[PDB]
Design a protein around this ligand. Structure first.
Ligand SMILES: [Mn+2]
Ligand SMILES: [Mn+2]
Ligand SMILES: [Mn+2]
Length: 317
């Protein structure tokens, strides 16, 4: 059967912002390069993957307070203005990109393309929750964010793949457990979860996470190779006769608190309370509100992109 596409919205429209020139502008002069690129990526995906189901996943909270409480440096270098509890922090985002996010969300809503979010969670968590719950169709998670490699799955069916956007969409290929195992040296039988344990240990500068000092990617992969899992590695450290080196024991034991905190920060949630903007995740084959879509697309200078999307939809069997 055809896959369900789960789109990491912010990953994709940030990529469109930096991959489409800012001289692409609306009639009022505001850049719409991210709008154009994001709509064009949806049309490309519809044509390449021919889904019947498609969801754009939102960041209802891009920097959840529960993660910051565990690790205060989490995404700290990306905050423009921190906001008190209950209110998402203001992310440092180019001034001419935020209005384009509003334009995109307005078009998706008027078209009826499903969007999903969960209060207090990231799009990463929405993607992890929807891919964990999927029982009917193969899942394609579309993102430039290597965090989501932890979601790859062969069994139980259906499979989960990440269409990874690190080199852009034209060059993107589907990552499964084999690809993550081959490119990162984690065990194949639990490749996705072990990738998250690898990232926890080595650190993640784009998320503001330091990792465990002294355990680089090479060491963490080999430790996972020999012991199979992070839990087994901590067991080897806590047990004073295991074959774990004393230097490794010192680095791991000196980080027990960070490791316990980081575990829930690094893993994406799989049971977030996701809500949809639409009744189902079915991809509409025509605009839910065509007059509003035409008025918005003209106002946002992307009428030809919307027309291209409708042609791709028209070609779906
Ligand atoms: Mn805050
Ligand atoms: Mn994200
Ligand atoms: Mn992420």
């Amino acid at each position: 059967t055809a896959p369900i596409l789960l789109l990491d919205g912010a990953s994709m429209w940030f990529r469109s912002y930096f991959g489409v020139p800012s001289s692409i502008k609306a009639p009022d002069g505001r850049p719409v390069n991210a709008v154009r690129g994001f709509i064009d990526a949806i049309s490309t995906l519809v044509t390449r993957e021919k889904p019947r189901r498609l969801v754009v996943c939102r960041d209802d909270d891009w920097r959840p307070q529960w993660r910051v409480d565990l690790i205060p440096s989490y995404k700290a270098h990306r905050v423009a203005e921190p906001e008190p509890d209950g209110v998402p922090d203001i992310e440092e985002v180019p001034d001419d990109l935020t209005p384009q996010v509003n334009m995109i969300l307005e078009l998706l809503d008027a078209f009826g393309i499903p969007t999903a979010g969960a209060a207090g969670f990231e799009a990463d968590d929405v993607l992890g929750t929807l891919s964990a719950r999927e029982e009917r169709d193969p899942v394609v998670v579309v993102s430039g964010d290597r965090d989501l490699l932890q979601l790859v799955r062969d069994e139980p069916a259906p499979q989960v793949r990440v269409l990874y956007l690190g080199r852009g969409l034209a060059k993107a290929t589907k990552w499964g457990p084999a690809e993550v195992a081959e490119q990162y040296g984690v065990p194949l039988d639990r490749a996705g979860t072990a990738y998250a344990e690898l990232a926890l240990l080595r650190g993640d500068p784009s998320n503001g996470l330091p990792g465990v000092a002294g355990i680089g990617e090479k060491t963490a992969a080999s430790l996972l190779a020999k012991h199979g899992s992070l839990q087994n590695i901590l067991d080897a450290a806590h047990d004073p006769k295991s074959g774990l080196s004393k230097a490794h024991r010192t680095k791991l034991l000196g980080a027990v608190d960070y490791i316990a905190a980081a575990e829930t920060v690094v893993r994406v949630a799989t049971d977030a309370p996701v809500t949809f903007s639409t009744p189902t995740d079915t991809l509409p084959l025509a605009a839910g509100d065509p007059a509003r879509v035409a008025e918005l697309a003209a106002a946002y200078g992307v009428s030809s992109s919307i027309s291209r999307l409708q042609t791709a939809l028209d070609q779906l069997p």
